């Protein structure tokens, strides 16, 4: 599974506020108070924000205590973690990250999902977002142009599921999406 895909800022060795928080599902919810919208929205927002903070902590601590070119495909920081029930998830989940520059994209995946596939897919997606959208100066192209991100994930990441795409199948999806936008 993948509960959500993220793009969030990463501080340098200012709160970490998710620029793009796509939640790929819902959770069962019953309080005696009638089922509202404020409660559910605030829950499904604070969970993702907490995951973003945890990935920021992991990335920063990895940066100081790695020594690997302190401050590039396999040269970016990578790692994994595990969450805490009721702080704030129901079913506990693993968190996968791969930070580039200052845009740490994360994946909240269930314990019955492949880790190596998660890291490979997050790598390919962050390459695609760095190139197709090219926000390495006009960062406004990431918030006012959220439709590009929406298109990219809706093509490659259908409904919180990871695919074992290979050269021929990536060629097929490249034939699919390349011309859909100018």
Binding mask 95-124 for other proteins (x = CB under 8 A): ------xxx------x-x-xxxx-xxx-x-
The only residue of 5, 131, 142, 174 in contact with other proteins, by rule CB under 8 A: 142
3-state SS of the chain? Answer: CCCEEEEEECCCCCCCCCCEEEECCCCCCCCCCCCCCHHHHHHHHHHHHHHHHHHHHHHHHHHHCCCCCCCCCCCCCEEEEECEECEEECCCCEEEEEEECCEEEEEEECCCCCHHHHHHHHHHHHHHHHHHHCCCCCHHHHCCCHHHHHHHHHHHCCCCCCCCCCHHHHHHHHHHHCCCCC
Shortest separation between residue 105's beta carbon and other proteins, angstroms: 13
Which residues within the stretch 28-47 sit at the binding site for other proteins (CB under 8 A)? Answer: 28-31, 35, 37-43, 45-47
Of 76, 128, 133, 151, the residue at the interface with other proteins (CB under 8 A) is 151
- Residue 174 beta carbon to other proteins: minimum distance, rounded to whole angstroms: 14
User: Residue 174 interacts with other proteins (CB under 8 A)?
Assistant: no
Interface with other proteins in residues 74-93 (CB under 8 A): 75, 78-82, 84, 86-90
Asked if 178 is part of the footprint of other proteins (rule: CB under 8 A), the reply reads: no
Q: Is 27 in the site for other proteins (CB under 8 A)?
A: yes
Nearer to other proteins, 42 or 174 (CB): 42
């Amino acid at each position: 599974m993948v509960h959500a895909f993220l793009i969030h800022t990463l501080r340098a060795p200012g709160l970490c506020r998710v620029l793009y928080s796509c939640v790929f599902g819902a959770e069962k919810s019953d309080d005696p108070r009638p089922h509202g919208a404020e409660r559910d929205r605030l829950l499904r927002k604070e969970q993702i924000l907490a995951v973003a903070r945890q990935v920021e902590s992991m990335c920063r601590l990895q940066q100081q205590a790695s020594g690997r070119p302190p401050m590039p495909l396999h040269e970016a920081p990578r790692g994994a973690f595990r969450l805490a029930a009721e702080n704030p998830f129901q079913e506990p989940r693993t968190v996968v990250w791969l930070g580039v520059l200052s845009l740490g994209f994360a994946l909240v995946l269930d314990a019955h999902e492949n880790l190596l596939l998660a890291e490979g897919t997050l790598r390919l997606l962050t390459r695609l977002l760095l190139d197709h959208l090219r926000l390495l100066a006009p960062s406004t192209s990431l918030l006012l142009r959220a439709d590009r991100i929406e298109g990219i994930l809706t093509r490659f990441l259908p409904h919180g599921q990871l695919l074992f795409l290979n050269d021929q199948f990536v060629q097929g999806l490249e034939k699919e999406f390349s011309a859909a936008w100018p």
